[PDB]
DNA sequence: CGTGATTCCAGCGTCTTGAAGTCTACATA
DNA sequence: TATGTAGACTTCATATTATTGGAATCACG
RNA sequence: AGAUGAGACGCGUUUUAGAGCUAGAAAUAGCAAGUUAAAAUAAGGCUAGUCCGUUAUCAACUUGAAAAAGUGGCACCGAGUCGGUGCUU
């Protein structure tokens, strides 16, 4: 019944929880232990951690589910195609389909003849010889007009439909005119007919090879132009070739036109633009451009497939046949050459399936790239292989028909081939003629994005609403599914709700309102300085409107030069202007406005606000519904305002992505007194010009209050729903839920009381190239030659001193002293703002100088004399991006305003307030779960204060007072960090009452910079209630205060509250108490048990083998003939005490053994456990003794050895290592784990401490041994570690600890893992036997681990 | 003849966009 | 006519790793 | 730098078919051939659909078919995974 506080630290893999009283001790409690063991009470501390498997995302589940749906859909499509052929096939061959369906079974289990296609070996051999592959059959069917057997037609159709190719390309691309060279000849003929006086000789030019080569468009155009000595690329023929290749040529020069004749086939408007062009050029040239477009289509076809013969009626089959012929010829040549020149490598390449040779490439698992890499050196070594080497460079050597690059084949090719086959063979089979439309519909059927899966109220993923209850087929899909209702449901379901307003719809990424908001947001912080203006002024409403209209509505991108010239010079008549806040091209732009102006060609319509809503409905309509038909259907309602060309142009364009804000948050909510929305505020703000971040965080505006009101009550009362809907990764949400459960358990344990303070902080969860680019840009801007004199790479630039030296161009930021490399060790990095005023330690805050005394006087900011010295030097670095704007202003803070009260207030808020918002939601959950009562004023009684603090304060506290953390020694660091969280939070709230307004939730009123800030000097006694003149937060804990020049100040031995007089910190006992708490050997580490769910087993389908470990992939197909999956993931083990038949006599012998239940059999076991256990071979099962052991069950054996049952057959280390604080401090100091920043005298003292306590290293190697012999029992690894340590006893202490930190994985918690001591690698130790835990003590531990239930398994059986 | 130590392995790619580099008609001396 | 010169426009990328439990393999007292 | 969600594509993997031949009596040796196709692609279930099955959740005991609810004093001295003492019961 004593007042106490709870400290919680939340992490992705950990939840640390500690309990503190008001004396900063740690309470210890007696707990009863249930079960049949002798122990009936155990004393445990209230500080510990909870560990669990990291939360797994749902991406894998989504991918697997989609794959399964696609496979079922494809199988049903094949079934429909078989249905169409059912009658005719039964007329021709009554058992063909049954033979096709059962081909996978071996001869023993087959019901018909083993040969599928024809049922006799002779006809099968004839078919295979007459057609090597199905592509030969398809081409033969297409070209020939003779009647073919029904089975061949069925096989061709099935292979066409089962693999229909992608549907990315929309429209039509196969006009049956795709011969590149032939179309080029036709274009030349048309050009010669139109221009008889200027003919072009194209004879001898291999246009087909040039255009179809794997080269860029410009390169191919140049190559083709080079083949015509008398033609240039800017000529009419060159422009036509560029258009065919897909470039953007201008025909204005060729015909001396006034309008810029820019024609591109990608743009839809070309359809009109060409015709309008013809208006000036006449109708004679139309055929020329039609031939050019046909040639372009031929080139596009040639991009994806290669063909030479002109007799092709099927562009795909001919290409595959050509590739097959090339493969055959190259294989024969390669075999001959290998047998001739290098007979020693014949067997390896052509017989060994293990190797990456041809045998492994065809029969084994060798991929194409592996085979190319293996055969390239052999081909290079041999002679006469120039053809093969060229093919290998072109990646077309010994290829197959099924390759990874077939994923670009559009369905048009297969559709055309199927249409050709049906046209050829319908004259001999009437049903094909009658059902041609059905087959084409089956092949082209694509379930549209909006429609979604075709469920009937049994699936939680589908939202399709049908017009009638009937089976859905591709032939009648147009009428069964109601398009409009499904589209509306898709709109209302798919869109992601706004984070700020959970009940509002987010805007489209390219919506007009969102783009306006983005433009205005950055527009309100732009400033301009001219000659006549004394001080820069903010853009007024008239200026912003003029800039938007003249620039944002006329130029796609607005640059700094454009802003300065087109507006300030043209309108404001300013010759020189200095733009502040924005540099270079603006990030925001009105792209959608320009796109709509291009389409509708009505600027006034876009400028009309009344039509805006309609425009919005357009943007969303183009944001989603990729399918064209629905775009047309929905835009039909607005088709009355636009022409058919405009409607088609709107249909063609499609947008992507989404925005970040809702529509109401931009223009829906209005302030109480002003009566203006956010966009209205940005339009006319006047003096303030507050941005969106300031507008939503302005305490003087109702916007923040409305945001707070809308945020709460986001969903129902259920905790699970609130956890689920939190914006974050699954791991962090699991951590939050576990944290809530842990704090509820703690509330329960402490006698149904309620904590007075709860502290929660959440751990935060490439650069070298960026820093190198920044350095290069700065050097190029300055022109210095320091890089040539001192070259460096990214590996050596780890130390911040070198980075500062490069950023300073080998100079000093305080004096005009040239930097010396040999003096870099003597140099001391100093913070621009002293550590007393602010603990920033950032790179921009760091400055490298010869002597810190040169920084200036005791004033925090460096002296303004240094500013007068190096104003230009600093501004050059600022303009060269070497330094940041914040760093430049901090260097010049003394000149500008010294140390204004605003700087102090900002420092305090930055040190205190939490930037992220997830912590606020966690605090809201905790407050609603603790505060449940109201006062007389109907206001929530805030008994529990949920204070939140950043991790930086706790890290600084750890580093200040020799409280060092090592993230590899053990897992107590989570609990210790939670304990320090609680201590710091309680101390800070007690010391500073008013600042609690920022800590505790929004119920407390806000304050201002007036209080707690002294105008000048360190006023003694704090009479005016000013808490800290210095801008620190936690500096009162230490016994001294440093200054900028090096001056020192002292603090009282005991710190007490300023007003109430309560003691807040007893420096004579509090540090000793914290040391004792951190030195406690007993900390509660419990692993959260998780019954394993997931894949039934590894998905790699292993070949057949003579073992029982294989699991059948189907009910009938036993694994002894067809192989199957292996290594199932055991969901949870089951301890059964029963008897099993033994020997030929089947004698029942009592056995106690662990049985693993797979995920596949889990449902069967959980339905009828007794029947399943009997089926596996257990007789007379003790139902009451069946004990469920999930993964991570805890076992204790003699001498405190702990194990975790990771599965049915592998155990994990279950013990933690409790090290004294002195050894941890020695390990952290000696290893230089973090940066060595600090006072040089302090660094020297730490180095002396490291040197004087070297022998501790040996002690550590002792303790692990004494630990290992009672915990790990891995003698070989321990001996190898001892030998390696003895070998490296002479290594320097700088690197004699970086290896010992990695050495602790030997006796760590979790799964065993291999490590490396210097160059000697110690492999992981495996526990292949779990028989011992059958005679150990099982420990059922509560979620926080305070309660126990010990079961002595030895007392069974 | 388990038994303990050692070795190898696990289903995976794409569905557009933006900065980079460059060629160009045009302004100015 | 020679040299910038903004500008329009094609081009080359536009994410990496990882545990840890199963099974196989093999020396071995 | 926040998660969930709809539609396709390309493969990969496993069995079978594409009679391997010659000299041996087999074991073996030599020679020819390599591309493709059918089925499956988590066991399967009922709700029988172009549905659903790898996300979230899950200590023990008692009640409740489930959703959920309820279960065990405290103080002090120390510290090798907690022990001892006092008090209460």
Numbering used by the authors: 2 to 766, 775 to 1366
Study text:
Cas9 is a CRISPR-associated endonuclease capable of RNA-guided, site-specific DNA cleavage. Cas9 enzymes rely on a dual guide RNA structure consisting of a CRISPR RNA (crRNA) guide and a trans-activating CRISPR RNA (tracrRNA) coactivator to cleave complementary DNA targets. Formation of a complete R-loop leads to the activation of the Cas9 HNH and RuvC nuclease domains to catalyse cleavage of the TS and non-target DNA strand (NTS), respectively. Here we report a series of cryo-electron microscopy structures of Streptococcus pyogenes Cas9 capturing the directional process of target DNA hybridization.
